[PDB]
């Protein structure tokens, strides 16, 4: 007795990839059997996992295009939802610098603890959640969905097929809506913009993007599953076993062991083909902004995989006016949505914006002490209009939902919060 | 048979207390002899601890006054020390709202769970300790030091004395300078600029002092000990169980059980002179920024204790182009200073400057994509005359100190970061 | 748009607390009304919480009694369930003095971080899921239910009634079936049959239980709420403000404003009756083991409430053999059952066998060496007879599972864990 | 102007290599200014790492040998010192299986989060700390040293270098006294007796146990470096590159790139000999425990380095039974100590007595109810005449050295712990 998560049977799932459009070409090597296989007798529902992808699904499919930002606090993605943004990107990069869970500042090298990014999922979530209660008991109506999906970075999975496994899962259980995965060796894995990558054979990568699949199949969810490559700059690659990669080895080798690889467009066309049929969006890592190297990309996969969606970071390791003039830069995004390129996110812009406005804060302070806060402040008090509302701090944080928890335990108590508060009386 | 971190004897104790001038005018109603008791047979060394409780109080007395912003995140306390300055001041409120253990978004109101501001001091001195290494590997000599001490909030110690006890210690094990103690119930705790507080008796919060400065003794470090009274806008106590508290007491009893008291300055001056024997400084949450006012609670406790530091909150909760002139903001804390208000600081500097930043990228995102980050990439250029380093963000989080380590170990390594990168090529 | 985790409406909660037979004398002082103003736009699932408080209360109705040992890792909760116990305890005490997120061993005084508990009661259902997924692909049916329910300790809610909400949020989010909350000072809480207890007002303890209640319903789950009461040797009481509280008061106060109280069984039964409106199973912590007075309890609750389920600690803190001969002793829990004792439990029961089993492992190899271990793998060896499987010790913790993973994702692996093991080849 | 925590001179680390015999036959293939340019300006002290490295090594030149049971939480770390040992096996399995960040049961394939390990470092230690603090205050002299030094698993490092480097550093700051490192791929770490293990190069794993030096130099600690090969039994490696490993390569390839290799005693030998100037002790994993294959391998590599002390690991993965008698069994860790196995321990062993005496309680609970724990407190009062002090479980956990701390800040309080305990009253 108690049939509270049973799972479903293969022929259920079986029919639903038949026949639900969510799974139109897309490849699974293991079968329905196969996965009930693994879910034991009860299965977890993840509902922030599972709403968050079918949101970002139809918004792929509804929208121009969808776009992100890089969030690594949960105040920093309400705010990009509270201005109107409809995905959050977590950026793995900003993970490792500013928010992982050995306490450390890192460079962009798989150094942090494998369970961080999951733990940022779970951190934004629940801040949307707490914007969303708070919202609801004042009838703030001004913020169609608070619960914005979420776009996570995998890295390289940190290590095995089984690494990548228990990494996808990790993110289900916090409520991802999609993850990335890109084909380097987690051990020497870099930035996309630094230097010294090491590209997986393509095979080993499917393998990768089939463990993510399997993970959330697994988890009965349908998890955006993103397929990067970064094979336009790598010059290394650990094997020459896979013959697609065979015209692009040289046959020279290093002290190490790995193999010499020319890099270039031309890699990431062949790789991101032969992930098209395992991944849900194809990202190319691009060492410049162009729009005429990402048409090249898009018209060369979609000659093959002409639904194919496709995904792009302007990255802020880019020096934007040093390689383009203002109307390109404000066409960008327009452009790129026409040649397929439907997720688009800057990945550090988290990093920067809380990095430079306190550093200007802190100047200023230094030099004129409340001078340099009351100019913050009046700013906070223009972007009013805009509908800015961090200004009343207390509420900001759930102060109202609070007193309300409170209120119904105990609608007599004398110590409720913002009853009597100096934001009540000069706010 | 080692000798490695052997407790000092009780004799060496004492005379430390009785011959350093840093113990000038500190009762410590326990003896020598009970802090070695607790000691068992290895003390461990508390280097950041030390150092910072050390410069601190240097500090305090060399400069005209010290003065600190809220950091929530390593990245920024890094950047408020890059702008100049001495010390960092680490908010309870900001990591209720923003960075505590639970993951959720809380109001200030103890919900969090009690090791969550020493992780965050934790992670402020290693991100000061990454920028140590990288400015040394660098020959970066603009910042004389960049391990600032660190001032963290207690809150009103998440119990009893013993809660006050293992705070303590877990805050000084991360690193911590200096800590501050509040007067309130910690079940009913709410932030100073918030509504119907409870006080606990004044031998109470003694007690609390008393526990606080136990624990740094226990751990042979010389932390800053700071009292917190929150009786201008209390009209709850728990108890009318001390002479001390009874001529505020007006009888009258809730249905809770708590006692009704006379709120205002005066239970704060009575308050502020009971805490300084165990105080090395002295705070009085008030409900707006007035000069006259810190000058009356100034000149009040300093009749009776001519040497005793004081500390003032500039707080946010309060709008300042309402109540005052530029020239008064202008001047506000160096007058301050004059009275010995020696700390200072802006307590959510941190969650104004993280929320607004990221709002207003968001929104200019909202409408016209790159255009909005372009202007946030060409104010951070325009930062680097004054001292900004965040724009080469791959140096920023250590790749060039990961990048030495690499070559260190291997010498012949063909996987470093900072070859080939854009930030090399772009930046 | 997504119409995935909608709240229910007021009207729909509301009938069900009218005709589910679960809420019969189930007193809430809010409203239907009321839960939904605080469960935002979206409802996460907690498949574990829903299904464990589901099996639990069938369990308190289908067996003459359920009984369970304290765990304090995975692993031990894993072999009670395999042992054949169908429920888990999970103890404060142990989690103070060995599993706790401080790290530190503590005494059962409320010192550790209060999200410890929610930590260990989502480590204990991951344990029971894995052995569940491992059954399923072994093909092993000798155990009907993995997933346990599991009853956790709330201790005294670390705070007010917003800690005690968000601890109970915080154990339905980890999968708990039940939870325990005691009538002491948080800050002054003690191990039941430790001294220095300090009781508060009956109605405080009615505002803790309502407080978990609503927590419950806003999570959605029908979690089992068990009062637990320690006036039995409590002799201090924060207040005499309560006039049920006020028979037992007798005139003296500490310094600290305590009131002492006159203590026993009496006190007890008026708690008891006064919780039982707000409580699924009410608990009286006892000074001895004693059956005379179990009845005398039993009887004068049940003659006010007839159908009041009740809960006993069957306590290591007893010297059993010294109050008790062998034949009450193995009657003990079947008496206690027919009295209404309908879930029984030793709280420090993996305390003493995890610390005996290893002290007594040590001493014997710290002289005999490996003829020490011998004789525990041969005890390990024999007691297979009886069901156990962690000799082998592989698949005991999933290397047959993960090995199913990884040939699901990529069948041809020469990397496979179990074919080749010293397991395989030698058990 | 502080000078707390200067770093050393390069002169004065020089001269220290140069004459403290702690280094002697220690290479480092990197330079003292090496070492300086990496440590900023401030070095914290790690006194339990430092004392723990200084204890463990003398006790390896002092002691006939040194053995270890593996431990898993602090309690059992702490049983195993009351029982006599003087050091603690921190099992990387075991915290797989039990003890990980993420929650998760693993088997040992480096599944969990890279900063489990040192986790429970710190966790041990606090556990010894709390133990001599309460037998400071009990006046208990029978231990020598409470806090016994920890050698703990680094397994492959989770990565490249700079992942090995900091674990160690990790590993260090939690208070470690040795680490041990092996040669095997770590995306495709296995246990040493599961099937499909990958070696890696052998001037990779010379990279590895540089980069694990690396660390302790900078961190300024004499970390014990252990080395371990698993080339017994793996019939993979990665790659051909290396000349040394040559010998034994057959030439053909899996489908993933692997090289097939010829497994034995042979390639260990050669392993060890090429291990041996950057290890301080040297460890070949084997499949059976057989006295004379362990002579083969200690002859050979002390026919080139006659001083180079080894380690054995007396393994559960074998069935002691099925391979050795009695007489054997008893005289095993003396005869393996004769031939240099100066560092001996049972890896899995709290993981073994853990699941028995559990399963062993549970199931006699489940037909017998108290009797069966009742048969485990007799055992333990019996066990009190060897030492054991667990059965007063109150002041094992430490209750009485907070009641000093309570009774430090305030002599007078009311609220006392262990005075009106059952524990007082019964025990
Ligand atoms: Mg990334
Ligand atoms: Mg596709
Ligand atoms: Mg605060
Ligand atoms: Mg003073
Ligand atoms: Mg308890
Ligand atoms: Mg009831
Ligand atoms: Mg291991
Ligand atoms: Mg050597």
Redesign the interface.
């Known amino acids: 007795?108690?049939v509270?998560?049973t799972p479903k049977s293969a022929e259920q799932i079986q029919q639903e990839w038949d026949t639900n459009p969510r799974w139109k070409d897309v490849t699974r090597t293991?079968s329905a059997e196969?996965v009930v296989?693994?879910?034991?007798?009860?299965?977890?529902?993840h509902?922030?996992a599972?709403?968050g992808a079918?949101?970002l699904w139809?918004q792929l499919h509804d929208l121009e295009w969808v776009?992100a930002?890089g969030?690594?606090?949960?105040?920093?993605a309400?705010?990009?939802v509270?201005?109107?943004?409809k995905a959050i990107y977590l950026s793995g990069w900003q993970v490792?610098?500013?928010?992982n869970?050995?306490?450390?500042?890192?460079?962009?090298?798989?150094?942090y603890?494998?369970?961080?990014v999951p733990?940022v999922v779970?951190?934004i979530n629940?801040?949307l959640?707490?914007?969303?209660?708070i919202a609801?008991?004042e009838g703030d109506t001004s913020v169609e969905?608070?619960?914005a999906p979420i776009v996570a970075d995998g890295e390289a999975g940190?290590?095995?097929?089984?690494?990548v496994?228990?990494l996808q899962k990790?993110l289900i259980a916090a409520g991802v809506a999609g993850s990335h995965w890109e084909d380097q060796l987690?051990?020497?894995?870099?930035?996309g913009?630094?230097?010294?990558?090491?590209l997986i054979?393509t095979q080993?990568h499917i393998?990768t993007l089939?463990?993510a699949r399997?993970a959330a199949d697994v988890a009965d969810v349908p998890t955006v599953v993103i397929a990067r490559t970064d094979a336009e700059?790598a010059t290394?690659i650990?094997?020459?076993?896979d013959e697609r990669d065979q015209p692009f080895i040289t046959g020279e080798?290093?002290?190490?062991?790995?193999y010499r690889t020319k890099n270039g467009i031309e890699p990431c066309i062949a790789r991101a083909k032969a992930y098209a049929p395992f991944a849900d969006l194809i990202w190319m890592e691009t060492?410049?902004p162009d729009l005429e190297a990402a048409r090249q990309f898009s018209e060369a996969v979609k000659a093959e995989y002409p639904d194919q969606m496709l995904a792009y970071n302007?990255?802020?390791?880019?020096?934007?006016?040093?390689?383009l003039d203002?109307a390109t830069?404000?066409k960008?995004?327009?452009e790129l949505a026409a040649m397929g390129f439907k997720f688009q996110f800057?990945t550090?812009?988290?990093?920067?914006?809380?990095?430079?406005?306190?550093?200007?804060?802190?100047?200023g302070?230094?030099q004129?002490?409340?001078?340099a806060?009351?100019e913050?402040?009046?700013?906070?008090f223009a972007?009013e209009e805009?509908?800015?509302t961090?200004t009343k701090?207390?509420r900001?944080?759930?102060?109202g939902?609070?007193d309300?928890?409170?209120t119904?335990?105990?609608p007599?108590?004398?110590?409720?919060?913002?009853?009597?508060?100096?934001?009540?009386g000069?706010?």
């Not at 296989?37 to 529902?45: C, M, Y």
């Not at 490792?96 to 928010?99: F, I, K, R, S």
């Not at 913050?376 to 906070?380: A, D």
């Open positions: 007795m108690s509270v998560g293991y196969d296989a693994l879910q034991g007798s009860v299965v977890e529902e509902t922030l599972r709403r079918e949101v139809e776009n930002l969030a690594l606090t949960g105040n920093m309400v705010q990009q509270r201005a109107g943004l490792a610098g500013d928010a869970l050995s306490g450390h500042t890192y460079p962009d090298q798989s150094l603890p494998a369970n961080s733990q779970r951190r629940n801040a959640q707490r914007a969303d209660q609801k008991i969905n608070w619960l940190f290590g095995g097929a089984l690494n496994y228990e990790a987690a051990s020497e894995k870099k930035c913009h630094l230097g010294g990558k090491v054979p080993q393998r089939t463990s399997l700059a290394l650990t094997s020459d076993v080798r290093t002290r190490e062991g790995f060492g410049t302007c990255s802020p390791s880019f020096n934007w006016k040093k390689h203002d830069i404000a960008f995004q327009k800057i550090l812009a988290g990093f920067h914006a809380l990095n430079y406005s306190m550093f200007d804060l802190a100047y302070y230094a004129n002490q409340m001078s806060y009351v913050l402040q009046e700013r906070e972007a805009r509908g800015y961090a701090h207390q900001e944080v759930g102060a939902y609070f309300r928890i409170a119904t335990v105990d007599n108590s004398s110590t409720t919060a913002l009853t009597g508060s100096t934001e009540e000069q706010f």
